[PDB]
C-alpha cells in the first residue's frame, strides 16, 4: 500500500536546513515566512526567494527523493495529480511533464522520477550546498497548481518529506517541511496566525 | 630620419639593434624617445620582454652606460604609476590574464632607483600604486621573492625600510595626524609586509610541529551556546582573527623556526617610537577599513607599544564588565566585587588562594583578568601595589622554594622549570597561571626564570631544536653530532632505542617509546624519523597534565584578548621577566627625582658616578638588591618611573629604601669613600638579609 513515514525530526550531526526571512505582513510583501506557525504564503509564479546558506560543504552529487504526502488520512494513499486546467494549458517550459507540480527554478539538478513503488512519481530534490555558507537558507520553490478543478484535486495540503538515498542504509533529511499552492498564494499572515492560534 | 614607431614592444635583440644604431649615429635622442614611449603606458610593458628569462637578468647591466637615461626614467616612473592605479583599482587584469606580472617586475629589478632623489615622488607613487593589487596577485608575486637568495631580498627590505625612515623623519606625526592617515607610509608598510612574508617563507617554517589542543570539556559559559539556541549552528567563533594572506599561503607568524634574517631587523624604530596605540586599538578592533591598523603587522612594533595595546584591551574589558554589572545589579540585584580582593592569611596564602580564586573563576573566568586589591589580615590601608608586589614575590619565591617540589632549578642556564614527573594536585598549577596573568596585567615585574619554551607552548606551540637548546643543549649537540654520523651506530655503541627519563627520585625508570624499545637496534638507513620522534617526545608529552593545568589557568585568565599573535613566543617574556639588555644611559635620560633636591645637584652627580664605577654585573646586582629584580622593567631602564627621595641628613643611622614603591631613598653623604664602602657592603649582602 501507500504507507507513509512518520512525521519526526531527523536533522543529523551536521546541520543543513532551511532559514527563513521575515519582512512584514503587508499585502504586497510575500517574500516572507510565518515566524510562529511555520507557513509559506509566497505568490504563485513569482520570484520570492530569501537568501541561502549551508554549514561548510556537504558533499553533493546524489539526488534525494521527496514525495508530497498529504496530512489527513482519508486520502493518505492518494496519488498527487497536476491540475487538469494547468495540465491541458501550455504554460510549462516543455520539459516539465503534465503530471508533476514541480517547477525547479531555485535550482537546476532535480528531475522527475517515475517511481512505481507505490504508483507515485516521486521527484527528487536538489541536495546541494546553497551558496556555501551565509545566512537563512531558502531554496526558491514556487508551484503553479490550482486544486479546485472538480477532479482529483480535493483541495488539501501536501508535505514534501525528504527521503535520502545514498551508499549508507540510513534515510536522512527529516525536517519541518512545508509546501502549499492552493487558497491564497501570498498576501499577509497575521490573520491566519490569529485564526489558527485559537485552535 | 626614422621615428622607430614600427616597433612598440622591447626585446633583447630589438633593443640591442636600437642601441647599435644609436651608437653608429652617435645620437641618444631616438633611444630617449623610444624609452619614453615604452614607459608611457602599461600595455607596452605588458607585451615587453615576452619570451618565445635571462633578458631581465642581463639587459639591465648595459642600460647604465650613460647618464641621460636616468632623467627619463624618473619622469617615466612618475607618470606611469597612476595609469597602473587606474588599471588596478577596477580592471581585474589578473583575472582576465595571468600574463600581467611583468610591469612591476621590470620597474623593480633595477637596483639603482634607491638614490634619494627618486624617493620623493618616484618610488612613493609606485608604492601608492602597489597598495592596491588583486589579493591573489600579491601572493603570486610573494612566491618568487620567497624562492630567491637572501642577500637581494634583504637589500630590498632595507631600501623599503629606509624609504619609511626618510618619510617618518620628514613627515610629522601627532594626535591630529596619526602614522596611518598618510597613504604613502601605509602603502610602504604593506609592501614591507609582503617582503616580511617572503622572508618568513624563506625560513624553515613548520606546521606539523604544532601540538594539538587537547582541551578537556572546559566549563562553558551558557552565552556561547545560547547562540546555538538562537538558531545558528556550532559557530566558527568570531574570536581569534587571522591575516588573509596567512590563509592564502597557509603560513602563520608562529610557524617560523629559523629565519634567513633576524625578525628584529624589520622593526622600524623611527616609526615605532612615534606610534600611538591607545586609539590604534580602537581603529583595530572595531575594524574601520579606511585606515590601517599597524597591529595587523605584528613585526613593526616592539615590546612597549604592544604591551600598551594589551593593557588597553584589559582596560576596555574592565570598562565593559563594569558597564554590564551596573545594570546586572540594577535589575537582577546580585552583588559582585569588581576588585579581585584575594584576602589571605600570612602563612596559608597558597591554600587560601586555591579556595578563593578558583571559586571566583569558575563562576566567571573573566574575574581572573581583573585588577586585584590585596588586603591581608593585621594591616590595613590603600594598596597601591606594594602589598600586591610583596604578595607576588613571596608567592613566587615560596614556589621557587623547594618546599613544594613542583618548581625545579638548573645551574647550567639559571632557569626555573616544572617538575618533570611529579604527582601534584591540579590546583597547585593554577595560582602560578593566575598570578602570571595578573603580572602580565598588573604591569608588575614577576621575578622568574621561565625559558622560551614556557612562553612558546603557552602560545600554542610545541618546542623545537632551538627551544630544546635552552635548558640542556648538550643533548642537542650530541644528537647533532650523530646527525652527520655516517658510521654504524649498532656496531659502535649498540645503544637501545630508549635512553633515559628523569623522575623525582632519580631512578632510571623503564620507559620504552614503542614495544620492545630495548630489543630494536638502531638503524642508520634513516635518521629523520629519529629526529622527528625525539623532537616530539623529549620536547613534549611529559608534562601534559601538570602543564595542562597551568596552561588552562593562564588561558582562563586570558582567553578573550588580542594576545595570541601580537606577541610572539620571544616577546611576552619581556612583559614579566624583564628586559635582557641593561643600558645605563636609558636610566640616566629617564630619571624622576623627588625629595626637594634639584636635578643639577653635585651630590646626585657623584652618586650617579659611584654607580658608573660599577660594571655590568655589579650594576645588575645593585638593581636586584634595590628594586628586588635582577632585570630592568618592561621597556628597560628607559621606560619606568623610578623615584629618588630623601631619607634624612648625612648620618649612618638606617639607610633603607621603600621597596614597596621602589623608591631609592639613598641618604645624602658628603665623603665618597664612605659611600663606596657602604655600597660595596650592600652589594655583598643583598638578599641574605631576608628583607626582600
Amino acid at each position: 500500500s501507500s504507507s507513509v513515514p512518520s512525521q519526526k525530526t531527523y536533522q543529523g550531526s551536521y546541520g543543513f536546513r532551511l532559514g527563513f526571512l521575515h519582512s512584514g505582513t503587508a499585502k504586497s510583501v510575500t517574500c516572507t515566512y510565518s515566524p510562529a506557525l511555520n507557513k509559506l504564503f509566497c505568490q504563485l509564479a513569482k520570484t520570492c526567494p530569501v537568501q541561502l546558506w549551508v554549514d561548510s560543504t556537504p558533499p553533493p552529487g546524489t539526488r534525494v527523493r521527496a514525495m508530497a504526502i498529504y496530512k489527513q488520512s482519508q486520502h493518505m494513499t492518494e496519488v498527487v495529480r497536476r491540475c487538469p486546467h494547468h495540465e491541458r494549458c501550455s504554460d510549462s517550459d516543455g520539459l516539465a511533464p503534465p503530471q508533476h507540480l514541480i517547477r525547479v527554478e531555485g535550482n537546476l539538478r532535480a528531475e522527475y522520477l517515475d517511481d512505481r513503488n507505490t504508483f507515485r512519481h516521486s521527484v527528487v530534490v536538489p541536495y546541494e550546498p546553497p551558496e556555501v555558507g551565509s545566512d537563512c537558507t531558502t531554496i526558491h520553490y514556487n508551484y503553479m497548481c490550482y486544486s479546485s478543478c472538480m477532479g482529483g484535486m480535493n483541495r488539501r495540503p501536501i508535505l514534501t518529506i525528504i527521503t535520502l538515498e545514498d551508499s549508507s542504509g540510513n534515510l536522512l533529511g527529516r525536517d519541518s517541511f512545508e509546501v502549499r499552492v492552493c487558497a491564497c498564494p501570498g498576501r499577509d499572515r497575521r490573520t491566519e496566525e490569529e485564526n489558527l492560534r485559537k485552535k | 630620419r626614422i621615428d622607430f614607431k614600427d616597433v612598440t614592444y622591447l626585446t633583447e635583440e630589438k633593443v640591442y639593434e636600437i642601441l647599435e644604431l644609436c651608437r653608429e649615429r652617435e645620437d641618444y635622442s631616438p633611444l630617449i624617445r623610444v624609452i619614453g614611449r615604452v614607459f608611457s603606458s602599461a600595455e607596452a610593458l605588458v607585451q615587453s620582454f615576452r619570451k618565445v628569462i635571462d633578458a631581465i637578468r642581463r639587459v639591465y647591466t648595459r642600460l647604465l652606460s650613460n647618464e641621460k637615461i636616468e632623467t627619463a626614467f624618473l619622469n617615466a616612473l612618475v607618470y606611469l604609476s597612476p595609469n597602473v592605479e587606474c588599471d588596478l583599482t577596477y580592471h581585474n587584469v589578473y583575472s582576465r590574464d595571468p600574463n600581467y606580472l611583468n610591469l612591476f617586475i621590470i620597474v623593480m629589478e633595477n637596483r639603482n632607483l634607491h638614490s634619494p632623489e627618486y624617493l620623493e615622488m618616484a618610488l612613493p607613487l609606485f608604492c601608492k600604486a602597489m597598495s592596491k593589487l588583486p589579493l591573489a596577485a600579491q601572493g603570486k608575486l610573494i612566491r618568487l621573492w620567497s624562492k630567491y637568495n637572501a642577500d637581494q631580498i634583504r637589500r630590498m627590505m632595507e631600501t623599503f625600510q629606509q624609504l619609511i625612515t626618510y618619510k617618518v623623519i620628514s613627515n610629522e606625526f601627532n594626535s591630529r595626524n596619526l602614522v596611518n592617515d598618510d597613504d604613502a607610509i601605509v602603502a610602504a608598510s604593506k609592501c614591507l609586509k609582503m617582503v616580511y612574508y617572503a622572508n618568513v617563507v624563506g625560513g624553515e617554517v613548520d606546521t606539523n610541529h604544532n601540538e594539538e589542543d587537547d582541551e578537556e570539556p572546559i566549563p562553558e559559559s551558557s552565552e556561547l551556546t545560547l547562540q546555538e539556541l538562537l538558531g545558528e549552528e556550532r559557530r566558527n567563533k568570531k574570536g581569534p582573527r587571522v591575516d588573509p594572506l596567512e590563509t592564502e599561503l597557509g603560513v602563520k607568524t608562529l610557524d617560523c623556526r629559523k629565519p634567513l634574517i633576524p625578525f628584529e631587523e624589520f622593526i622600524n624604530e623611527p616609526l615605532n617610537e612615534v606610534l600611538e596605540m591607545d586609539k590604534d586599538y580602537t581603529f583595530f578592533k572595531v575594524e574601520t577599513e579606511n585606515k590601517f591598523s599597524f597591529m595587523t603587522c605584528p613585526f613593526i612594533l616592539n615590546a612597549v607599544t604592544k604591551n600598551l595595546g594589551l593593557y588597553y584591551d584589559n582596560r576596555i574589558r574592565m570598562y565593559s564588565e563594569r558597564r554590564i554589572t551596573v545594570l546586572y545589579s540594577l535589575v537582577q540585584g546580585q552583588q559582585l566585587n569588581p576588585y579581585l580582593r584575594l584576602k589571605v592569611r600570612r602563612d596559608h596564602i597558597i591554600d587560601d588562594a586555591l579556595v578563593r580564586l578558583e571559586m571566583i573563576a569558575m563562576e566567571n573566568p573573566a574575574d581572573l583578568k581583573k585588577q586585584l586589591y590585596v588586603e591581608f589580615e593585621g594591616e590595613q590601608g590603600v594598596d597601591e601595589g606594594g602589598v600586591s608586589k610583596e604578595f607576588f614575590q613571596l608567592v613566587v619565591e615560596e614556589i621557587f622554594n623547594p618546599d613544594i617540589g613542583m618548581f625545579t632549578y638548573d645551574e647550567s642556564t639559571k632557569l626555573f622549570w616544572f617538575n618533570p614527573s611529579s604527582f601534584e594536585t591540579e590546583g597547585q598549577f593554577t595560582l602560578i597561571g593566575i598570578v602570571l596573568g595578573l603580572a602580565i596585567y598588573n604591569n608588575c615585574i614577576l621575578d622568574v626564570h621561565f625559558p622560551m619554551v614556557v612562553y612558546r607552548k603557552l602560545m600554542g606551540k610545541k618546542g623545537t631544536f632551538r627551544d630544546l637548546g635552552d635548558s640542556h643543549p648538550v643533548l642537542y649537540q650530541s644528537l647533532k653530532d650523530l646527525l652527520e654520523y655516517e658510521g654504524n651506530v649498532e656496531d659502535d655503541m649498540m645503544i637501545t632505542f630508549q635512553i633515559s627519563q628523569t623522575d623525582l627520585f632519580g631512578n632510571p625508570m623503564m620507559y620504552d617509546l614503542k614495544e620492545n624499545g630495548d630489543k630494536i637496534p638502531i638503524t642508520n638507513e634513516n635518521r629523520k624519523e629519529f629526529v622527528n620522534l625525539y623532537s616530539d617526545y623529549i620536547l613534549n608529552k611529559s608534562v601534559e597534565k601538570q602543564f595542562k593545568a597551568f596552561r588552562r589557568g593562564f588561558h582562563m585568565v586570558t582567553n578573550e584578548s588580542p594576545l595570541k599573535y601580537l606577541f610572539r613566543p620571544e616577546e611576552i617574556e619581556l612583559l614579566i621577566c624583564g628586559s635582557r639588555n641593561l643600558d645605563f644611559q636609558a636610566l640616566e635620560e629617564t630619571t624622576e627625582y623627588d625629595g626637594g633636591y634639584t636635578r643639577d645637584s653635585v651630590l646626585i652627580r657623584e652618586f650617579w658616578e659611584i654607580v658608573h664605577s660599577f660594571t655590568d654585573e655589579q650594576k645588575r646586582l645593585f638593581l636586584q638588591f634595590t628594586t628586588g629584580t635582577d632585570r630592568a622593567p618592561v621597556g628597560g631602564l628607559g621606560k619606568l618611573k623610578m623615584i629618588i627621595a630623601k631619607n634624612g641628613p648625612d648620618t649612618e643611622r638606617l639607610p633603607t629604601s621603600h621597596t614597596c614603591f621602589n623608591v631609592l631613598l639613598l641618604p645624602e653623604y658628603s665623603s665618597k669613600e664612605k659611600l663606596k664602602e657602604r655600597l660595596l657592603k650592600a652589594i655583598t649582602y643583598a638578599k641574605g638579609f631576608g628583607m626582600l
Partner: protein, 143 residues
C-alpha cells in the same frame, strides 16, 4: 527525555505534533527561569525562532522575560566589523540578506519595522561581529 543527538527537535510548534497535541496541549519546563511554560511565552518563542537543544539529556524550552538576560551581556563586550559597506560582502562568498541576521537585541531574525528605526538615531550602533541587530516592539520604551 530526548537524548538522540541526530534527531534533535528544533521548533516548539514543530514539536507540538508528535507530543500528541494539536496546538494547545504542550506542557514543558524552562531552564534559565525554572518555570512551567506560558501561552504568551510560547507565542514569543515562536516569535523569535529559537532552536531547542537538550540540557543534560532533557530538552527544555526558553521563556520570554529572560530575553534581555543572557543576551545583554554580549552586546558591549566583543566587537568586530561595524560598517554597511563591503565589510561583510567579500570575506564570504554570499554577502548577506537584505537586512536579516541572527539578532541579539530584537532577537528575532528580522523585525518588519526595524530597517530604519536604528538609522533614525545614529547613536553607537551595536553592529556586533557584523550582525545588524534591531529593536522589537516588546522592548520599545522603558518598561
Amino acid at each position: 527525555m530526548f537524548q538522540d543527538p541526530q534527531e534533535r527537535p528544533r521548533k516548539l510548534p514543530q514539536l507540538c505534533t508528535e507530543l500528541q497535541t494539536t496546538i494547545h496541549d504542550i506542557i514543558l519546563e524552562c531552564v534559565y527561569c525554572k518555570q512551567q511554560l506560558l501561552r504568551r511565552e510560547v507565542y514569543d518563542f515562536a516569535f523569535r525562532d529559537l532552536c531547542i537543544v537538550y540540557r543534560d539529556g532533557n530538552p527544555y524550552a526558553v521563556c520570554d522575560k529572560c530575553l534581555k538576560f543572557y543576551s545583554k551581556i554580549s552586546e558591549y563586550r566583543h566587537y568586530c566589523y561595524s560598517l554597511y559597506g563591503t565589510t561583510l560582502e567579500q570575506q564570504y562568498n554570499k554577502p548577506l540578506c537584505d537586512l536579516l541576521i541572527r539578532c541579539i537585541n530584537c532577537q528575532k531574525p528580522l523585525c518588519p519595522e526595524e530597517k530604519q528605526r536604528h538609522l533614525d538615531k545614529k547613536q553607537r550602533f551595536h553592529n556586533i561581529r557584523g550582525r545588524w541587530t534591531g529593536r522589537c516592539m516588546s522592548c520599545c520604551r522603558s518598561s
